């Protein structure tokens, strides 16, 4: 049957930073594993976050806030802007 | 002070029995200041009280450290 992963979306991004660099399957499994985690770690807390304020619907703010919980300092500042941009790009059109 | 009767309490230190001169009070209040409102509020608490007392006596991005 058909089981899904992320390697293709990985590989475009790979070609966005390194357009002429290969990657091993042992590595590709690692990224699939790695990305799945990082989703999960935030995904729970933001879910928890909603429970904390007795609210009942997850938004990007919680994701935004949740990211602030995990990612260290300078990197957090980067992605939060990138999180900020994309939705702005999304919401604008 | 936010307590006018305490202000009254303090002022009469020298104006008692045994004072042989004229008591000349010089309160310092800052012009164009919030102290103006306190004194007006001090008066507010003063007059809500003096009126009845007088009746009582009489009757970043893209900057990764790596």
The two tokens of residue A29 are 């499994």
The Cα A68–Cα B65 span in angstroms is: 18
For chains A and B, CB pairs below 8 A equal: 14
Asked if residues A67 and A83 have their Cβ atoms less than 8 Å apart, the reply is yes
DSSP letter (8 states) at residue B28: -
The residue of A72, A76, A77 whose CB has the most chain B CBs within 10 angstroms, and thus the best one to mutate to test that interface, is: A77
CA–CA dist B38, B27 (Å, integer): 13
Dig out the tokens for A71 from the structure. Answer: 């990612």
Does A17 lie at the interface with B, CB-CB under 8 angstroms?
no
Cβ <8 Å between A78 and B65: no
Please give the method by which this entry was determined: cryo-EM
Q: What is the DSSP letter of A61?
A: H
């Amino acid at each position: 049957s058909r089981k899904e992963s992320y390697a293709i979306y990985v590989y475009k991004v790979l070609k966005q930073v390194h357009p002429d660099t290969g990657i091993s399957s042992k590595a590709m499994s690692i990224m699939n594993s790695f990305v799945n985690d990082v989703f999960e770690r935030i995904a729970g807390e933001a879910s928890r976050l909603a429970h904390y304020n007795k609210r009942s619907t997850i938004t990007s703010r919680e994701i935004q806030t949740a990211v602030r919980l995990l990612l260290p300092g300078e990197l957090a500042k980067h992605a939060v802007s990138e999180g900020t941009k994309a939705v702005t790009k999304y919401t604008s059109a | 002070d936010w307590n006018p009767q305490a202000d009254l309490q303090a002022m009469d230190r020298a104006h008692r029995i045994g004072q042989k001169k004229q008591v000349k009070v010089f309160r310092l209040v800052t012009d164009n200041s919030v102290e103006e409102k306190i004194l007006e509020r001090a008066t507010q608490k003063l007059r809500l009280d003096q009126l009845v007392i007088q009746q009582n006596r009489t009757s970043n991005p893209t900057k990764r450290e790596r």
